Amino acid sequence: MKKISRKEYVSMYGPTTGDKVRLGDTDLIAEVEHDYTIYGEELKFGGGKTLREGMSQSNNPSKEELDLIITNALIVDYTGIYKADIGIKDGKIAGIGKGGNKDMQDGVKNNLSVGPATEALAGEGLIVTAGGIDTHIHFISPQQIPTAFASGVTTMIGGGTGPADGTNATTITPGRRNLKWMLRAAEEYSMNLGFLAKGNASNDASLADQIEAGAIGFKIHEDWGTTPSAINHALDVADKYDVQVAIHTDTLNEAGCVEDTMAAIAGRTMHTFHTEGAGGGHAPDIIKVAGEHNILPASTNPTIPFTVNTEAEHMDMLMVCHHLDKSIKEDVQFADSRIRPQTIAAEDTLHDMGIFSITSSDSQAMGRVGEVITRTWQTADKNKKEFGRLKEEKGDNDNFRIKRYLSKYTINPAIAHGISEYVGSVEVGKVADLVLWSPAFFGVKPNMIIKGGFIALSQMGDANASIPTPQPVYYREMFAHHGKAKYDANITFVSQAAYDKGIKEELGLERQVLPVKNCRNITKKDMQFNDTTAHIEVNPETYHVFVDGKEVTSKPANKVSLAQLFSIF
Amino acid sequence: MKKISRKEYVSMYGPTTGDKVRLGDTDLIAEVEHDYTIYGEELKFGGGKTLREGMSQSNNPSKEELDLIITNALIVDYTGIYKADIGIKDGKIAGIGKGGNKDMQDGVKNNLSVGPATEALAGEGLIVTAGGIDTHIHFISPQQIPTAFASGVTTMIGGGTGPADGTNATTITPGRRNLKWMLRAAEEYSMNLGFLAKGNASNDASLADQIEAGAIGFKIHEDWGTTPSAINHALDVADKYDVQVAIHTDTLNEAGCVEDTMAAIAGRTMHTFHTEGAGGGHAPDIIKVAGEHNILPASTNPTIPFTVNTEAEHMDMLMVCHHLDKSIKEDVQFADSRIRPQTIAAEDTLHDMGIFSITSSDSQAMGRVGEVITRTWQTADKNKKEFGRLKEEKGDNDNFRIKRYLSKYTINPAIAHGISEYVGSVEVGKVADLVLWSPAFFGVKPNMIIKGGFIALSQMGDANASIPTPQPVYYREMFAHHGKAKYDANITFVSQAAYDKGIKEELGLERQVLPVKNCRNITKKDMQFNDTTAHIEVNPETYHVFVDGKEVTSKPANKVSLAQLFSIF
Amino acid sequence: MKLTPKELDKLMLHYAGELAKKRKEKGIKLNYVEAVALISAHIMEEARAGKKTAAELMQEGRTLLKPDDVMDGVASMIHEVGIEAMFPDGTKLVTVHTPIEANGKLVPGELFLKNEDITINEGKKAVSVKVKNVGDRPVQIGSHFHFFEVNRCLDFDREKTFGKRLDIASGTAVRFEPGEEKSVELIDIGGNRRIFGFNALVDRQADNESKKIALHRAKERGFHGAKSDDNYVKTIKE
Amino acid sequence: MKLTPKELDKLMLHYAGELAKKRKEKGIKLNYVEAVALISAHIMEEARAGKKTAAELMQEGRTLLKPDDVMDGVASMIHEVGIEAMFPDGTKLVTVHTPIEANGKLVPGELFLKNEDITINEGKKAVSVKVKNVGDRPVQIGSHFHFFEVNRCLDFDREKTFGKRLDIASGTAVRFEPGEEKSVELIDIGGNRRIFGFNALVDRQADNESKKIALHRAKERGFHGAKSDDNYVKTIKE
């Protein structure tokens, strides 16, 4: 035996148990909870390192020999912040723990066997998280997909048919033919994709036809008419077909108030966009639904974190998103907002308390697709600076806050949309949708994206260079992004009904086609680290939000982290 | 909240964390290490119990809704002795933990969801273990299979073609045609079955032909000629085809001694029968191979535990097994044994120390098929009485000894024969080959056997009775034992080569046909709780066995447990 | 320096703005593309400098180009320039409305309208109804909403308004402030007069027989001003 | 002017560097991207000028940015800037290490380590062996190489080292210079102790019986320090 200094050990292999790492330039400190490695047997790749024929690469490997192994990765997940080797086999996460050669090392399971068929990826000093899941995507342009992918999002659930006005306003892919258009266009992109149908219809036959055509859920948007009849019918059909329903409630209170909307929902699972109201007529009372069990609340990028400039852009974003001409007196008079800095500030505190469970974009319709993760971590850092460490922290670290805010965009949307069996976390059996970050750039710029067990996007330098590092370095598509490899790497999510009817062969899709499941029997209690159901007393006379009596508010941030240190523009 | 007395709680739901239960009439005490249940939410089936529509049976179940749930079972496994609900779905163990209804109970995972399609099995007050795996089966008569099944053995690996003399002596199914005979006859029985071919051949073509015909390994038996050439050729072919090799070494020292046999083995994985020698000429020096890494040692029923009558029957068993006529002077003179009470006593101590990794029968050839589990637990109890608690016990219980002796016949033979992916333990993803014991009858008489997710054998009373309990109660085949249900319930293990060539369709087998894997890259270090590799100094002048210097011996038992209290004959 | 596609696009936009600025210095009158690029690049640079707020940038964007610095028609063509700029407190959308004053010489795509008013809903007679918002929030009703089924916090004679909608330009809305009482004009719904959706008070053909069912439903659900007889006779389907 | 994709990328990088330089002139503190782009663009321009060598450019790249010219954390984030520049004698890779001195205020992604040493290979007793390199070249041995089968120009008691590996941090190496004699610590190889590959001296389970075969093979193949008996008895398989 021998003892080496912890500084040298960490430089060689990355942080181990009890070591703390700052996340980005924020104030959040993540502590390694436990380590699967055996000291002195660490896997290293290089000139004279251990990952060599006969030393750590087995010459008699198990039949579960890995296709790819990520060595010494700091896994940051809702299941824990720990250190391990991630084994990937056949596009899934084959195992998490100590990998290597059973012939020359101890404590190596059969599912983590490194052999001659194994590629090596050095994760030492690198954080591995699950790919982001953005569930509010307005499919306005296909250029959103590479932007989100470079930001670290690997799954996009949304709706749209291009830059139509219906898509500019709503997250809706209406009808069987438009669903076929979008599903066949999806073959191009390196991103897991799911499409939502139009729920604004009192026709059970039409709603069922959309679900059987391939939508994974319904979107009931105010711009297509959010009426109690439509809500009721969409929820009935969705309970029949086991698909999620998302709602963007009525801003004008035309047919009723928040109480009438909640009565129409009638205690059935519903995923709410802009649970803070986003200036709608249901605000600020719609925040009350964030305390109900059956409501999965999501908040959009632009209002988090609350900053000095947050309120200035809201009216322009609202008018352009809702398609109201700024040169028309009638449209300008119609564009009435109930937004308040009190509500905008309360949104961040509700996120910190776990009242809001999902963070999303609403891309290019009051929201930025490539800033979901960045704004989530900006909110986490701002709340850490304001209120200090959470009372749930069991140590001198921010692990609980890290896990809560990471669940906000990784596992909670996966559970909400019924894809948590496949994606959302770094767990054995899930698809290998992994993001490699360096801790200095965590939350803003990933090192690389592993899509379905193969590298799909990566920071790359000059192609003519003698090494991959020299400038200019930017995000380039890798081999999993090209040819027929993307068909194996990517997943299109459909409903179970469409999957059974054989949507893949009928539409000639080459991507993996997977059915969503367990969308109806989930409540707020099923969200990870964000299951706080509290009676939210909203005084609309004073626009005051109280949870368990205590008032909630936050001060605007004059300067956020992960914003100007990392981006030229 | 409320507090109820521990006695009442245990009567209602079985022992919980920290509670101790005696195993059978032995002196072994198992302590519940942890409990997955949430107090006050226990699953109970009955008149006004919890497993009812809407309370614990979900009205909106998950898509992974269980087919069968075993409630409040005390799982005794090499992975730990704990309390949980076992969920079975599609013939596999779907989940282990807290089951029930997510709508009305907390902490219920999606894979443990009880719904309208779920059958309930009350395991409260019952121990659940994996089915036994017997790897030395001389397939002499098919009546052995129900006997072992009633004893608690669910997998039988062996060889034979009926009561031929070659089968009476050896565990060998020789040749493609005889393998076809046995594989097609296997469709009748409710037991997982694997067949070993003849390894006693210097012909690589013949050995490979047997493996491709469907054997899961080779058996090199002295009665067919255990020569170094045959050992070498069989090991070469087995390394080519990834199948186990078992050996019953030369008794006569015709071609060489233990050193020559080990030189022929040449440090390749080999599973040894009668590693104590069983009176062979290699004894007692063959016990030395039990300290090598590449040797997986097994010991047979008759010599454990060492009793007053152990030595009396050995010569008769040896002569009848080896087919030497007792009326012939030449055969009687040939029947020379080197058995010693010192070796027989040392065998039990080696089992206690973990030097011997596998217990088996050698059914109807010096061994009793329906006594593997009983004799393993008799040895454990005798060693507990003699040497007291093991030094590895972390508490006032015998959990470590329980796990070691349970691994001796559950997980260690599965690892040795490359079927540990399917059977051998109560783990998620493994096939549901479970045995339900009442703790008073643990190790001698099971309550019931679950084969492939369905009850295959059970204690049952009079068929004309108004309840299942009244006498006469004996072991009867259940529905998984009959019709075409046994095809879905049972597994035939074959080599990967035969599986790839399509042995199932070629032979018209209706059972599940599964390939064995990872047989060549395992050593003694891969045995659970029985991986002790120690230099075994055997003095043949004194027949004295020493491990790490200390001599090993045991005294004969005048009276064993689990023997006459439980059996009329 | 890991560059995102957004950053590459912004770099292209910045250098288009630089080219426009160089041409303006040379004295070339800027065209539509050059003017838009110049304003956008200037806003981005100011935000990167970080001494100004988004409101200050919105004000400053309107002072960059004089009417004599652009070609004829550019000011008419440019209605607003939006640009997402990275401030010290994150990315914010800066919108500059009418950055250049119109010279009036040339108006590309200009309309030459007749001086005659458009008569909407011709041939439909409008009735007048007084509506009070007794709720605590303002209520906006669209031109084609079935007025009988509006927010139950609005108080009016619903029997008068069964089968009718607001007599306003389609796509416009009428706002009722809380406590405020307004008089609105209502016209019959055209076409098949099949009311489906809304508050599910009708969900069938709008006639006098369905009027009674709708009124009973509205009274049961608490819609203000809906008067149904106490002794209401149910039908086989309702 | 046939432009290659590499040239287009370099043009983009050069104009990113120009933007960074303009911001620095304006007085904006550069961020990470701007600093990297500025250094790379300056190196490219100097190489095109062709009055400096690659060594001169490596030196000069470290003087471009003062610690007060960049935001906090940029100097910590930038470890080295590589750039492939076209010199008069072809394309060469210029690497500038630590181009900016760290201020120490903010360190993104910084580690907060415990002050406790890591004990590697715990529970394994190490034996000491004296090794001489009688060859003419230095020899590097990794932490997990089976020390028995190392370069035959190393001289030591191979019998002592059968089944053992160096007791050092995994991934590190020990260098034996020619003529130099060193003492190394060796620990037993763990796991199944199946040695495959290396110099094919064992190719089987490592035990006392395979030790004799390995020693005879090493003596036959001329491995220094391998002592095998002259009267060696062969086995059936060896």
Swiss-Prot record, chains A, B:
Pfam families hit by this protein: Amidohydro_1, Urease_alpha
Residues of the active site: H322
Residues recorded as bearing N6-carboxylysine in the entry: K219
A single GO BP: urea catabolic process
CDD domains, per the entry: Urease_alpha (cd00375)
Cellular component aspect of the GO annotation: cytoplasm
Molecular function as annotated in GO: nickel cation binding; urease activity
Reactions catalysed: urea + 2 H2O + H(+) = hydrogencarbonate + 2 NH4(+)
Residues annotated for Ni(2+) 2 binding in this entry: K219, H248, H274
EC nos: 3.5.1.5
Result of knocking out the encoding gene: Cells do not express urease.
Entry binding sites for Ni(2+) 1: H136, H138, K219, D362
Subcellular localization, as worded in the UniProt entry: Cytoplasm
Principal subcellular localisation of the protein: cytoplasm
UniProt PTM: Carboxylation allows a single lysine to coordinate two nickel ions.
UniProt family annotation: Belongs to the metallo-dependent hydrolases superfamily. Urease alpha subunit family.
PANTHER family from the UniProt entry: UREASE
Other comment: The novel dodecameric structure of the enzyme may allow it to remain active at the cell surface at acidic gastric pH. Within this dodecameric structure the 12 active sites are clustered within the interior of the proteinaceous shell. This may allow a high local concentration of ammonia within the enzyme which may protect the nickel-chelating groups from protonation.
Protein name: Urease subunit beta
From Swiss-Prot, chains C, D:
Naturally occurring in which organism (per UniProt): Helicobacter pylori (strain ATCC 700392 / 26695) (Campylobacter pylori)
Subunit description: Heterohexamer of 3 UreA (alpha) and 3 UreB (beta) subunits. Four heterohexamers assemble to form a 16 nm dodecameric complex.
Gene (UniProt): ureA
Annotated catalysed reactions: urea + 2 H2O + H(+) = hydrogencarbonate + 2 NH4(+)
Compartments, as annotated in UniProt: Cytoplasm
Entry-linked InterPro entries: Urease_beta-like (IPR002019), Urease_betasu_sf (IPR036461), Urease_gamma-beta_su (IPR008223), Urease_gamma/gamma-beta_su (IPR002026), Urease_gamma_sf (IPR036463), Urease_subunit (IPR050069)
Classification via SUPFAM superfamilies: Urease, beta-subunit, Urease, gamma-subunit
Function: Ammonia produced by ureolysis increases the gastric pH thereby providing an environment permissive for colonization of the stomach.
Name by which UniProt lists this protein: Urease subunit alpha
